[PDB]
Amino acid sequence: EHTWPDKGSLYIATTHTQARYALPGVIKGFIERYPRVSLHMHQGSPTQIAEAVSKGNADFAIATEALHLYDDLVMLPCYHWNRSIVVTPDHPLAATSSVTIEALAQYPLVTYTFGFTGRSELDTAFNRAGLTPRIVFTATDADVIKTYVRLGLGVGVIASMAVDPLADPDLVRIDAHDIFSHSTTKIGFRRSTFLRSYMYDFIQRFAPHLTRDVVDTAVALRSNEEIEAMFQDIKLPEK
Amino acid sequence: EHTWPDKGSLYIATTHTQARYALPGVIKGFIERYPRVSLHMHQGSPTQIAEAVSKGNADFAIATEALHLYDDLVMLPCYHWNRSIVVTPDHPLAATSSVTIEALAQYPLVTYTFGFTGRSELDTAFNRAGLTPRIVFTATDADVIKTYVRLGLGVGVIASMAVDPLADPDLVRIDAHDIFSHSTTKIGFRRSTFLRSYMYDFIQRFAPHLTRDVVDTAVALRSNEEIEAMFQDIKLPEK
Ligand SMILES: CC(=O)OC[C@H](N)C(=O)O
Ligand SMILES: CC(=O)OC[C@H](N)C(=O)O
């Protein structure tokens, strides 16, 4: 009843951050439309995620590993995203008129770890202002991080999508898009993967600008550089 | 005011599961008692966690990696824990009089990945009953897993401590201690680490049976085997 009868396997290798905040909608949508597609899902670190799809278990990889050893696979820009700073309401940073990277910094921090969902600005955006802050905590998911900010171990820096005013009503969102450059989530797959219609539909459902035609031409280029050139004048979804 | 003035560094390498469910209480307790101890915390995979403490960044490692390449460090049994099966209330397994590993199995599963917080039974406890089930999903944390069970991608198997009737009131806990053997969380540190009083206190706060004296004698032995022998007749906390 309003479903495609397409039969086939779809194996995704993705990160926590992706699996938790960016993927659920799509997946629920997808699996409802394709009851004959065996959707398998495997979470993990950028290198294994690179490894899995590369040679050669999973069909797609979904991650902010704009990082390398990715050349084998066709990488496609999906969206940008940045970070919010979260604190307990009783924090000095709460009652502050737009904080700076130096105004941060004076504090002990609970961030992500490198490399795993873009802390690849943190430190490398800190040494930039010649700064080195106390990182009392590095983790891989925001929910752990959030709960340790509730403890008061330090100030947290997480993806803006990882704050949910509903889910997180004991924290203060402070947007830091000014403070840190955005991160790009891409989607990979090796050239030799035959692209199935459900796959295009999935790509499309996850990144609206990635239509069959866009996709095809992006893979017609011999480079991920060339691809990112293709979109350098396309405004991505900003998440 | 009722705090120890002890000054020093305490760096912990632990897993998601540990950081999220087993560690928060202790840490909050600890840091309140030792405002001069620089508590640093770093989450990650068993191998890096082994690596971090080993050679030789972090003081303690806290994990269910009873797995090896651990010989360098003194490993101490902390507690046992097992798994619950979680499903949507509308699931066939909900209305079931104590399910078997075969009664499971007939289903698509959302579990942990190997190696990362004990799925090292799953498959190796499945091939045992000669079984091979559909694993539509492997992740590293229960919250991701739970949410995909809410989607209906499959049946979830997570740590019993990762279900929280308060936090998770849309799921069905089904205890599987019968079904799968328990896992042991241990705590490591290399022999050469001078043991500080706050460290003993911390060890103690996390594993009540690990008193100064127990600890000392456990390290007086030349083996983790010998240590586990020491406790083979001690009933551990069961979590
Ligand atoms: C990042 C987020 O909140 O969801 C975006 C999702 N990729 C979509 O476009 O459906
Ligand atoms: C596993 C859990 O829920 O907490 C146990 C904790 N290690 C303690 O003994 O304080």
From Swiss-Prot, chains A, B:
Keyword match Cytoplasm: yes
Chief location of this protein within or outside the cell: cytoplasm
GO CC terms: cytoplasm
Subcellular location: Cytoplasm
GO biological process: cysteine biosynthetic process; regulation of DNA-templated transcription
Position of the signal peptide: none
Keyword Manganese: no
Keywords: Activator, Amino-acid biosynthesis, Cysteine biosynthesis, Cytoplasm, DNA-binding, Transcription, Transcription regulation
An annotated Gene Ontology molecular function: DNA-binding transcription factor activity
Function: This protein is a positive regulator of gene expression for the cysteine regulon, a system of 10 or more loci involved in the biosynthesis of L-cysteine from inorganic sulfate. The inducer for CysB is N-acetylserine. CysB inhibits its own transcription.
Family assignment from sequence similarity: Belongs to the LysR transcriptional regulatory family.
Self-association state and partner proteins as the record states: Homotetramer.
Designated name of the protein: HTH-type transcriptional regulator CysB
Organism expressing this protein natively: Salmonella typhimurium (strain LT2 / SGSC1412 / ATCC 700720)
Gene name for this UniProt entry: cysB
Residues of the whole record sequence present: 86 to 324 of 324
